[PDB]
Design brief:
It is classed as viral protein. The structure is cut from a larger assembly and holds 3 copies of chain A and 3 copies of chain B. Chain A is 23% helix and 33% strand. Chain A has 3 helices and 6 strands; from the N terminus they run H-E-E-E-H-E-E-E-H. In chain A, a hairpin with a 5-residue loop joins strand 4 and strand 5. Chain B is built from 3 helices and 16 strands. In chain B, a hairpin with a 2-residue loop joins strand 6 and strand 7. Chain B is extended, with a radius of gyration of 27 Å. The termini of chain B are far apart. The chains are: A alpha+beta, B mainly beta. Chains in contact: A-B, A-C, A-E, B-C, B-E, C-D, C-E, C-F, D-E, D-F, E-F. At the E-F interface, helix 1, helix 2, strand 4 and strand 5 of E face strand 2, strand 3 and helix 3 of F.
Chain lengths: 165, 299, 299, 100, 165, 165
């Protein structure tokens, strides 16, 4: 994949990954992800429920404050409008009351959701080509603490003081 | 040298209380000296402290400070000589949401313990004729978690009292919010009016960097060469307590590996139950530092 | 342990008054001790309290509080000793819309009872030479409904009086709004100046969690073994009154099921009319708790 | 019972003065006791009151009120006894346009 | 449908469903819904009156305040402009004076509309393909109290402490 | 048409209808309406003057204040630019100085225009398919008092207390 430097460790959590793990633990059978899988698109008449999490441009990161704010868009896709609204209600009831809540992702790292507020309320979008799926989307402003605010200024200075200096 | 080293910014000593909780207790209880369990090093709030419930997220507590400076000038100098401070008052306010007994008792400065609900669960809370002087013991606990090791940052104000109360707007889009401004006084028993504190495994990691106590340089395990019995006797099991020169017990943090598990097996908790009669070397595995020990087994 | 338990946020004790009402009454009426019906546990405003009508939704009532702090310092201490509170004045204001007789009487501080409209339904309301000192008994009733069980949160201020009045802008896009700031005095009969209160089935649900009275642990039905007659005699019917150890009559909340309806039939209201001469077991069906009783029938 | 009955909001007693007019008169004229015609029940402004013309629509009259409160305390009580009002002054202002 | 966890109870009311029930009780013969039914689209020259309620992104939910604020768009479709304006007038006279009003939906749950203001006033939209239908649309800002503000942090902590922890 | 409940009475006036009546009384021969009639579009080379009033989303209704604010767009269509500007000047002179003015519509109800300000000034729009018609359009903010602020909470409560409760 990507060969990052040996001295670099992750500083931010993946909000999409964190919530994908959370909602695969909460809803085991229903599949959640950041993408529309090719095999999920194969069936439309009898469509399996799914939840999509997309990170969006929103909120200001605070490196000094060890905070990582982002706008998360949740797309609930089911075969019925009532089912979509029920699943969106479940998602809202899970995300909204969060305040300093810890969650251990599949990676084994325990994150911490500082807060989760709603920017744009839920709404049923008009159908596109996929006509039998009723989708309900809502955007949330999610703030999660960073893994570490440690800076790598030492390595940056060493680089150009060894090559150019 | 390079300039960034002069600042020496850790960037990990910025603890943010992510779930701040206020715990009020009656003046009859014993004030909390610390929130660290002596036996486990975990958060142990003493009994008698009852939380005031959830408050407003966006506002939060505003822990205020006031200083009374009296720069005594005797005979005329270009700068004051012996500038002293008279009073330091610590105040904090929060917009409570819960309609609990303690919240309304604090707001109305009365003791509603004798308030008996009617046969249909109806209570009326009359305001006192004269506002009573009721003192409380307050704790403001916040938890910041690094990985899975939390930092319990807290304050210990043992003689708080309600000073003022904000006006309440009763609309349809907002719930009733009580916003008292508690003022912290100096208790004559414990001798302090406020005490900031830190605890937790995260603070065990950050304490040496913060500057409290000696630096973490060496680690030792107290039993030089313990002996345990193969049979289920009294000495069947033993305990390993790795402790650095800082004086802090690092047993939960340090994982021990045994070179010869066949003779003696030691888990991450330093269990010395043993397997077979023999001598095995136990190496306390940590990061930048490491420790070594030897454990013998004999029935 | 886990940190979220320390806060213990109920999140359902945040009552929001969704339809706030103000009911002014003349000083000659008897002040309301409570707004709970003794025979039914329902909202029962005593006669003589007339509503001031609708007021501005976005502004609402600003129930203000003021404290007179006199921190007496005797001989010089780093913190004040015996910080007392002299006066606590409770004021509330609202922007009335109705041009009713009571509203204008309050605004003009006069009694317009004798103001007789002309033959063409015209009235003129002269202001008094000197503003009169007219006292009113006010109630601020608000209802928050959980499902179909309402919570009637109210204040009982028995000696209010007008203090100030905001300037009125007379444009074409807004109606005339009267915005008096009533100040609550301490009535010497009831002994209090303001009394917050809660009532309703929702409060019957939330009172144990709020911390008032003993916790709900046991439920009993007062008749141990009642006997009713098959014939339409005096003892044909009886009443079941399930009452917990909290002292609260939980009869409307609790639904009763009869194992043998043929002998004795008991509905959700605890009707003991009966069907046939026999003994039937009645089980008071609640949620986490349950109660049991036996009912016999004999003509 | 139902809660909306307790408020008893008429919603038709909110009179909004849609064309506010100010009529100043010299001190020599007789003040108007009422503006209702005794014989017809119609608006009959007495003679001598001359309108000051149109004023600013968005500003309008600001009928102000001021209270002089003197809560006399004699021997010290948690609440004042016999809180009296000294003066009540009524003022109103308007941005006239006419150069009459 | 959707198999939600056994320990989860509904926390938000369905504003669209609540108003659909309310205006099917108020207007029995005239059909109201959140969608254009296929059988309703069958007749156009003599079109039956209908009302549509659409939840739109608007207002901020207050979980701590037990308030759920949303923007509700009402689309009144009749065969005549006068009829559409009369029906929109009826809808406005119903929603606007609401303040703490209660209503028992078809589910048997009694909701509580905190307030209902108007964001965008009524307007007669230009005809589309359905040329004989006059539609009058308006948007309302509706705030309704939540069913329960109870959080499920304990269940999530159990989940991630039993699976991973 | 629409069979509204018997207990319901109209609460809002029709601003478009009120001004259509007003400008059919003021200008009898010239036709004013809320729509383009089919017979009016029949003649284009020698086009008869007309005035169109369209209610637009704008202003906030105040049910408690008995005020119904809306944005009204007036489109003056004539065969000449001078005629269109003269008619728009007449409309502006009729609407702008209104302050608490009463007017008895064709329904026999005497409305009351609280105020009438101008949001967007007049402008001669570019020609479309109808090339010989010069149209001058302006938008006014018209505030008119409601017929009655009486609420029907009693009937609403009776509905669900008789059907469900």
């Amino acid at each position: 994949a990507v060969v990052l430097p040996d001295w670099y460790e992750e500083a931010f959590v993946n909000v999409e990954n964190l919530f994908i793990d959370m909602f695969t633990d909460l809803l085991p059978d229903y599949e959640s992800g950041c993408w529309a899988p090719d095999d999920w698109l194969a069936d439309e008449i009898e469509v399996k429920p799914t939840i999509w999490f997309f990170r969006l441009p929103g909120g200001r990161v605070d490196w000094d404050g060890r905070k990582d704010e982002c706008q998360l868009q949740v797309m609930v896709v089911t075969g019925s409008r009532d089912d979509s609204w029920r699943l969106m209600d479940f998602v809202r009831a899970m995300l909204l009351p969060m305040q300093g809540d810890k969650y251990k992702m599949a990676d084994g790292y325990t994150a911490q959701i500082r807060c989760a507020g709603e920017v744009a309320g839920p709404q049923l979008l008009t159908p596109g080509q996929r006509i039998d799926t009723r989708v309900v989307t809502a955007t949330f402003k999610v703030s999660v603490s960073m893994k570490s605010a440690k800076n790598y200024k030492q390595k940056l200075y060493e680089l150009w003081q060894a090559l150019r200096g | 040298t390079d300039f960034y080293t002069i600042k020496d910014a850790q960037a990990d000593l910025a603890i943010a209380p992510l779930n701040l909780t206020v715990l009020l207790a009656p003046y009859s209880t014993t004030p909390a000296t610390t929130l660290e369990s002596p036996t486990d090093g975990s958060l142990a709030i003493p009994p008698g402290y009852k939380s005031v419930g959830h408050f407003e997220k966006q506002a939060g507590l505003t822990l205020g400070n006031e200083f009374d400076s009296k720069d005594i000038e005797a005979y005329g100098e270009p700068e004051p000589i012996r500038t002293i401070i008279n009073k330091r008052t610590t105040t904090f306010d929060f917009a409570m949401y819960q309609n609990q007994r303690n919240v309304l008792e604090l707001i109305w400065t009365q003791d509603f313990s004798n308030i008996q609900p009617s046969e249909f669960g109806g209570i009326v809370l009359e305001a006192p004729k004269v506002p009573k002087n009721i003192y409380y013991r307050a704790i403001l606990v916040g938890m910041d978690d690094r990985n899975d090791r939390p930092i319990w940052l807290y304050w210990l104000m043992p003689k708080v009292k309600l000073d003022k109360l904000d006006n309440q707007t009763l609309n349809d889009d907002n719930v009733i919010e009580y916003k008292p401004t508690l003022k912290a006084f100096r208790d004559d028993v414990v001798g302090y009016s406020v005490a900031q504190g830190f605890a937790g495994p995260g603070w065990r990691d950050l304490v040496a960097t913060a500057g409290f106590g000696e630096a973490l340089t060496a680690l030792t395990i107290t039993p030089g060469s313990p002996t345990v019995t193969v049979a289920t006797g009294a000495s069947h099991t033993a305990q390993l307590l790795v402790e650095g020169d800082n004086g802090i017990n690092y047993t939960p943090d340090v994982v021990f590996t045994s070179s010869a598990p066949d003779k003696a097996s030691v888990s991450a908790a330093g269990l010395v139950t043993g397997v077979a009669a023999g001598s095995a070397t136990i190496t306390a595995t940590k990061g930048a530092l490491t420790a070594t020990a030897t454990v013998t087994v004999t029935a």
